[PDB]
Symmetry: C3
Subunit: 318 residues, 3 copies
C-alpha cells in the first residue's frame, strides 16, 4: 500500500491525565466499531501494535496541584518508545486515546524519527498550560507546554517527565477549533506568536481558507511530516457528546471531515492522535455510538475516504 | 402569472425503484401539507395534472440483480409522456415523488420539448450506477446512467427500457451535496469529467461560491432551461429524516433554501423533482412532519419565496 | 475599567407589545443565570439600575388593530428616560427585555445623548411594520417604523406615542438574520434602500464578509456609537427555542458570537438590547436554560469575552 495508507495502530488505554473515568475505554469502543477492518476495506496496510499496558503506580503523590505526575509521565514515556518503533518501521502512527496528555509521548516519539515534523492540533482547547499556570492540575490540558522549545526553563522538574526533551518550536504548531482557552494559555499563545485558528477565525474565513493557510504555514518552504493531534471535543457536542470537556459552538461534522480530507491529500500525514473519546459520558447509548462513529469517520478520512467517492485503479465499465 | 411561477403539478406514487415501502405515499402527504394552496398564495398559476396511475405488473422477474425492471421502465414512460404534455402547455413540471428512478421519465419528458436543458442534481448520491456496475440492483440509484449520451453501449437491453433514448451529455449535469458515491459511480464521475460539488467542495467554497460556479458552468455561454432534480436525502437527516437512504453531514436547511432561491432568481427553472420523501421511515410523527415541511419550503423557494421577503407590485405605504 | 466594559443594566419587564405572556420574566431569568457575576468576572464595571416599574395602564383599548398602545408607548417613554440617564453616567446601556417594542424607547433614549448612533438589528424579523401595514397589530413588530426619519407622515397618531420623534435615518440601520419579513415590511425595506443581511446574504457571503460589510457601512465615513438591538429569535430555534416568534434556518451559536465579538472589537458599542427571551415558552425546562445560556453567552461576547481567550496585563509565567 501507499505511504499515506501504511498504518501502525497503537491503543493507549489511559485516563490519569484527567479526573473523569471512561476515556481509557476509548481504544476498546473504537476497535469494537470495526475501525481496523474499515481501514483494510479502504486499501490500507494495517499493523496492530496492540493496546499499551499501563502499570498502576502506587503512592503517585501530586506535584503541587498537578495530579498523577508519575502515571502520566510513564504512560507518555511508554507511548514515545512505541510511536518511535512504528515510525522506524515506515508506518503512520495511529494513537487511539485515552486522554490528550499522551500527546507528550506521541509527538516526542514521532520527533525522534522525524525532527522536522509540523503539528496540526484540532481541539476546543490549547492544552498549553504549564505545571505552574494550570488551575485544575489535570495534565491533559498541559501536553504542548512540555513539547515546546520556547517553554524550556518555564517547565519545573515534574516527577516522571525527566525523559522529556522539547522537540517542537512555537512556529511548528497550528491550532484549529479553539473556544475555551485559559488566561495563562492565551498569554503563552500571544507572547510566543503561535499560529491559531480559533472558532472566531473559522467563522471569519471558512474551513477552506483555514486549511489553505494551515498547510501553507507548515509546508510553504518545503514538504515536511505532519502530526495531526485530534481531540474529539474540537468538534461540536452535537457530533461528539461522549467527551470529558465538551464546549458548545464547535467544528461541524463536515468541517472535521474537511480538515482530515485536506491533510490526507498532501500525502504527508506521518503521526495521528484520536483522543478524548469517553464512552461512559454519553447521556444515552446513541450519544456514545454518535461520538465513536464520528471519531471513526475522522480517522477514515485521514487515510483516504473521500466524500466525492473512492475507486480502485480498475475499469468498472468493462 | 409570470413564467417562473406557472406550474403543472404531477403526482408520481411509485416505490418499486427501491425495497423500502412508503415512498409512494410522498405525493399524498406533500398535498396534505397544503403545497398547492401555499403556491397559489405566492402568486403562482397552479394546475394539478393529478396522481399518475401506475398499474401493478405481475411476474416482473429481475434482470440479473436489477429488481422490478418492467415496473420502473413503465412508470418512467408514463411520466415522460406527462412531463412533455405539461411542458407543451407552457408550465414548469413539478414531479412529486416517489423514488428517484422516476428522474429517467421526468428528464426524458422535459428534453422532448426542451432538448438544450441543463440538470442541477441535489442529492447525497450520484445515482449514476449502470445496470451492470450496481451492487444493490435498485433502479433509484441508476437514473443518470440511462440519461447520459456517453454511457450509450454500456446500458444493456433492460425489459421495459426500450423507449429510453439518452437526452443529456456528461457536460450538461452538475451535482450538489455528494457524500455517498459508490466505487463504480466515482469511476464514471471522474472518467466522464462531470462537474460536481460534493460536501468537500461545499465546505471549501461555501454555498455562495457553489451556486455562482454551478449557474456560470451551465448558463454561461447562453440562457438555457433548468431541470432541478432535488432528492430530500441531499439535505442532512436533521432536516429530512423520513427518507430511504439518509447520510450524515448533509446540506443545511439554509443551504437548501439558498440553492433553490438562486435557481428561482435566474427565471430559467423549467423542470422540478421533489424525490425520496418516505412518510413511513420517520422514527417519530414529528420526523415525518419535519421532512414534509422542509420539502414544502424547498419547493416554495423554487417558485419565488425569498427569506428577505416578498411583496405584490402595489404601494403598501398608500 | 474600560469604556467598552463599563455597563449600566436596565431591567425592562414588559410584555404588552405581543400577546404571549412570560417575556416580562426575561430580566428575572437572565439575572438568575448569573449575568452580572459573569460580566464582573470579565473585568466589567457593572451598575444595576433595577427593573423598571411598568405601572398598570388599564382601559387601554386598541388603536384600530394595534393592541395595548398606551402601555407600549409609556413603557418605551419610561425606558427612553432611563437609557438617557445611564448614557449621561458614561455607561453602556444594557436593556434586558421584555418584548422588542421596547427598542422604540431604548434607541430614542440612547439617541438623546448620542444622536450620531448607528443601529445593528440582529433578528429573524424587520419589525418595520407601520401601525397601518401591520396585520397582527402587535407593537413588537413595529419599533423601527416609529424610529425611521424617512417614514415621517406615514406613522398615525397612536395613543401613548406623542413623545416619539424619529431619531435614525434609513442609512444608519443594518439588519442581520432576516427570514420572516411581511409584504408591507419588504416594500419599506426595498423602497427606503435599507442595508440588510437576510439568511440568503449570510449563506452567500459568510458571517465574516457580513460583519466586514456591516461595520464598514456604519463606521466607514466616521467613527460613531453603535446600538446593538439583539432579538434572540435572530438565532436558530436549536439555540434559542424559548421565544415568541421562532423561525427555522437561523443564525448559528458561532455566527451570533462572531457578530457580537466583532462589535466589541470596534470599541464603539454604546447601547445593547437582549430581547424576546420568554422563559414560559420552553417545551421542556432544558429549552428555557438553553435560551437563557445562549442569551447570556451572546451578552458576554458584547463586553470582551473572546473565543481565542482573554488574559490580564500580568506575566502568567512569573
Ligand atoms: O484542565 C485544564 O487546564 C483546562 C481547564 C478549563 N477547560 C480546558 C482548558 N484548560 C481544560 C483542558 C482540556 C484538555 B483537552 O483539550 O480536553 O484534552
Ligand atoms: O443503490 C445504490 O446504487 C446505492 C447503494 C449505496 N447507497 C447509495 C449510493 N448507491 C444508493 C442509491 C440511493 C438512491 B437515491 O439517491 O436515494 O435516490
Ligand atoms: O407582528 C408582526 O408584524 C409579524 C407577523 C409575522 N411574523 C413576524 C414579522 N411580522 C411578526 C413580528 C415579530 C416581532 B419580533 O421580531 O419577534 O420582535
Ligand atoms: Mn485536548
Ligand atoms: Mn479538548
Ligand atoms: Mn437520488
Ligand atoms: Mn439520494
Ligand atoms: Mn424583534
Ligand atoms: Mn424577531
Amino acid at each position: 500500500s501507499a505511504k499515506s495508507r501504511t498504518i501502525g495502530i497503537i491503543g493507549a488505554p489511559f485516563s490519569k491525565g484527567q479526573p473523569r473515568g471512561g476515556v481509557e475505554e476509548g481504544p476498546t469502543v473504537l476497535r469494537k466499531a470495526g475501525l481496523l477492518e474499515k481501514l483494510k476495506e479502504q486499501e490500507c496496510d494495517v499493523k496492530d501494535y496492540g493496546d499499551l499496558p499501563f502499570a498502576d503506580i502506587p503512592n503517585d503523590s501530586p506535584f503541587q496541584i498537578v495530579k498523577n505526575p508519575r502515571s502520566v509521565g510513564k504512560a507518555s514515556e511508554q507511548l514515545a518508545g512505541k510511536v518511535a518503533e512504528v515510525k522506524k518501521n515506515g508506518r503512520i502512527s495511529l494513537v487511539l486515546g485515552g486522554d490528550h496528555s499522551l500527546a507528550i509521548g506521541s509527538i516526542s516519539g514521532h520527533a525522534r524519527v522525524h525532527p522536522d515534523l509540523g503539528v496540526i492540533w484540532v481541539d476546543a482547547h490549547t492544552d498549553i498550560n504549564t505545571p505552574l499556570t494550570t488551575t485544575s492540575g489535570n495534565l491533559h490540558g498541559q501536553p504542548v507546554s512540555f513539547l515546546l522549545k520556547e517553554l524550556k526553563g518555564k517547565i519545573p522538574d515534574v516527577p516522571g517527565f525527566s525523559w522529556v526533551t522539547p522537540c517542537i518550536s512555537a512556529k511548528d504548531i497550528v491550532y484549529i477549533g479553539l473556544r475555551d482557552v485559559d488566561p495563562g494559555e492565551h498569554y503563552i499563545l500571544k507572547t510566543l506568536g503561535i499560529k491559531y485558528f480559533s472558532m472566531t477565525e473559522v467563522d471569519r474565513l471558512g474551513i477552506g481558507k483555514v486549511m489553505e493557510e494551515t498547510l501553507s504555514y507548515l509546508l510553504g518552504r518545503k514538504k515536511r511530516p505532519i502530526h495531526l493531534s485530534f481531540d474529539v471535543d474540537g468538534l461540536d457536542p452535537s457530533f461528539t457528546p461522549a467527551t470529558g470537556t465538551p464546549v458548545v459552538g464547535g467544528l461541524t461534522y463536515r468541517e472535521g471531515l474537511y480538515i482530515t480530507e485536506e491533510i490526507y491529500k498532501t500525502g504527508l500525514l506521518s503521526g495521528l492522535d484520536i483522543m478524548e473519546v469517553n464512552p461512559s459520558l454519553g447521556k444515552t447509548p446513541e450519544e456514545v455510538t454518535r461520538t465513536v462513529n464520528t471519531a471513526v469517520a475522522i480517522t477514515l478520512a485521514c487515510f483516504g475516504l473521500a466524500r466525492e467517492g473512492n475507486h480502485k485503479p480498475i475499469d468498472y465499465l468493462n
